[model samples]
Target: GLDSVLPPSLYALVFTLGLPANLLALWAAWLQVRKGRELGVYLLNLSLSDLLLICALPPWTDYYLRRDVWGYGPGACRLFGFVFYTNLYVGAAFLSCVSADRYLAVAHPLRFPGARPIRSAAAVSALIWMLELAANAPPLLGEAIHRDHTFCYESYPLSGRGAALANVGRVLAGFLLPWGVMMLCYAGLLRALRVRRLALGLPCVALLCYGPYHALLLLRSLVFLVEERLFPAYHASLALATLNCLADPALYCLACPGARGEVAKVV
Candidate 1:
C-alpha cells in the first residue's frame, strides 16, 4: 500500500504538532466561554472536535506503522473509528457555525446585537453533535471486521444499500451542506471584512484544507459503486482532511484576535 509507510510518518507529525496546538487553543477557548463570549462557545466546540481527532492519531499511527494490523481488537477499533469519522463532520459543522456566527456579527449586527448569549451557541453545538452522531451511526452499527480479520478503517461491513446510504449522507451532510454554509457565511464575512482583509485568510486556508478532501471523498463514492478497491489517493486525501485539526488553531487565532493575544500572554 502506498500509504502503509507514509501515513504513519504523517500521523507522527500531526500528533507532535496538532496535540499541543489544539490543547492550548482549547484552553484559551474554554476561558473565553467561561467569560460568556459567544464565538468562544463555537471555538470551544471546534477545539474539542479537533482534540478528539488529534488524540486518536497516536493509535492510528501505530496501526499504520504495524502495516494496517489491528492488534487493538474489534471494539477499540470500532470505538476509534467512530470517534475519528464522527469528529470529522463535527469539526466541519462547528467551523461552519463559527463562520456563520462571525458573518451574523459582522453583516447583521442590528439583527443579532452585540455578544449574543453563550447558551444559544451551546444549543447549536449540541444540535450539531446530534446530527453528526446520527449521520455516522449506521456504519458504526454495521461492522468493522476486515477480510484479514483485523480492525481498521479500510473495512466497514455494510450492506450495499447501507454503504450507499452512508456515502450519500456523508456527501450531503458531511461535505456539500457544510461547504455551502461555509461559503455563504464567508461570502458575507468577506463583504463585512472589507476593511480588515486579513480576517479572510483563515477561512480561505480552511477552504483549501477541506475542499479537496471532500471532493476526493465524493469521487471515491462514485468510483466505489462499481469497484471494490479504492485508489491509494483516497487514503492520502483522508490524511489531508486530518490536517484540518492542525489548521484550526490558525482559524481560532485569526477569528478571535483578542483571545489570541490573551492566549499569547498566558503562553
Candidate 2:
C-alpha cells in the first residue's frame, strides 16, 4: 500500500514543536507583564496570535492525515478558514506595532518614554481587533469550503469579482503595508543598535515567509489567468506563511533583547 504521508508528517512536526512553545510563551508573557513589563504587549499579543494559530493547525493535521478528507462539517471548515485568514492580518498588525515601538524608541524618545505605553499598547490592540473583526468577518459567513465537501478554502482560480477584489486589497493591506512599516522601522533600529544582523532578522524573515503568498495573490487577483497549474505553489506559499511564526518568539526576542531587559528590570 502506497501512502503519501509527507504533508501530514510535516504538519505534525510543526504542530508538535509549535503547540508547547506558544503556550509557555503566552503564560510567560503574562507573567512578565504582571511583573510590570509593559512595553512588549505587542510581542505578547504577537505570541497570542501564534497561540491562535496553534489551535488552528490540528484540524489541518487531521485532514491531511486522513489524506485530504475533511471530517469536520461546513461550520468547522469556515471557522478554521476565518482563523488563519484573520491571522495573516493580525500577525502583520502586531508586527507593525512592535516595529513602530522601536522606531519611536530610536527616533523620538521623549514622546514615547514616560507616557503610559501600557494603556496605548492595550488601546492599539483593541483598535486592531475591532478593525479585524470587521474587516475579516466575511470569511466566516462565506461558504468557502470547497464544492466537493472535502476541501476547505482550497478553491481554485476565481470565485467572483468580490473575492478577487478582496484578494487585491488583502495583499496590499496585509503584506505590503506591513512590510514597508517594518523596513522603515528596521532602518531606525540599525541606526541606533549598530547590529544590522539583529535589526533585519525579523523583518527579513517576515518578508521571506509572506512575500511569496502575497505576490502570487497580487498577480492572480488582478487577472484570472492561472489555474491548477499555479495551485500547488499557492498552497505551499500559504502554508509557509502560516508557519512564519515558527520563528516569532525566538526571532522577536533575538532582535530585541533589550525589550526583555525592561521586564528583567522589574522581575
Candidate 3:
C-alpha cells in the first residue's frame, strides 16, 4: 500500500543524503575498532548494522518512487528486505547490548578487571551477531519477489497471516524486548549514579532511534489486517519510519560521548 501514490522527489532526496551520511559514520565507527578500543568495536558493529539498513534502502526507494514495482529481481528483493529488516531490528538489539555494557562498567567497575576481562566485549559483540542472524530468519524464508503496484514485498507465506505474524514478532522482539533490557540497564545506571541526573538523553536515544519505526509498523499491520480499506495516507507513516535511519547516527553520537569523542580525536 505504501508503494503507491507518493512523489519520488522526497524519497530521492532522502536516498541521496542518507547513504553518504551513513557511510561516513560507518567509516568513523570502523576506525575506532582498528585502534583497539572496545567501545570502538561496539560502535563499529553498531554502525555497520545501521549502514547496511541504509544501503538496502535505495532499491526499495527506487521501486516505490517508480510507483511500487519491483525493478530489482526476485532474489534481490528477498535479499534486500532481508538485510534491511534484519539490520534495523538486530541493530536495535546490539544497541541494548551496548547500553548493558556501559551500565556494567559504571555500576560494577571492580568486575571489569576480573576473569575474562580482555575478551569480554568481543565475546558479547560476537554473540550479538549470532543472535541477529537468527532474528532475521523470516525474510530469508524464500519469499519470491514480484512486480506489483500496491507494494514490493516478499510474497509472504500466508498472505495476510504470515505477514501479520512476522509483524507481531518484529514488534515484540525488536521493540519491546530491547527496550525492556535498555530500561533495566538504565535503571541500574541511575542507581549506580545515586539517582543523580546523568543524561536524560541516553534512553531517549533508543526511543528516537526505533520508537517511530515500530509504531508505524504496528500501524501498518493494523491497517492491513483490520481496516481493510488500506488508506494511502498510511504510506506517509511508512515513509516517516525511514527517518529512523537519519536519526540513528545522531542518536549514536549523542549517546556514546566517549566513543564519538575518540573518533573526533583520531580525525
Candidate 3: residue 130 Cα off by (Å) = 2.5
Give candidate 2 misplaced runs (Cα > 4 Å): 1-7, 69-73, 138-151, 192-196, 255-267
Stretches off by above 4 angstroms in model 3 are 1-36, 112-118, 138-161, 195-202, 216-230, 255-267
Q: Rank the candidates by TM-score, best first.
A: 1, 2, 3
Q: Which candidate order results from sorting by lDDT in descending order?
A: 2, 1, 3
With a 3 Å backbone cut-off (N, CA, C), the pairs that clash in candidate 1 are none
- Clash number for each model: 0, 0, 0
What is the TM-score of candidate 1?
0.81
Residue pairs clashing, model 3? none
The better candidate by lDDT, 2 or 3, is: 2
Model 1 regions lying over 4 Å from their true place: 1-4, 69-73, 138-152, 156-159, 192-199, 224-230, 255-267
lDDT of 1 at 61: 62
Most accurate candidate by lDDT: 2
Candidate 3 backbone clash number? 0
Tens-place lDDT per residue, model 3, 57-135, is 5667666666544555555566646555665666566677667766766676765534434367788788878876764
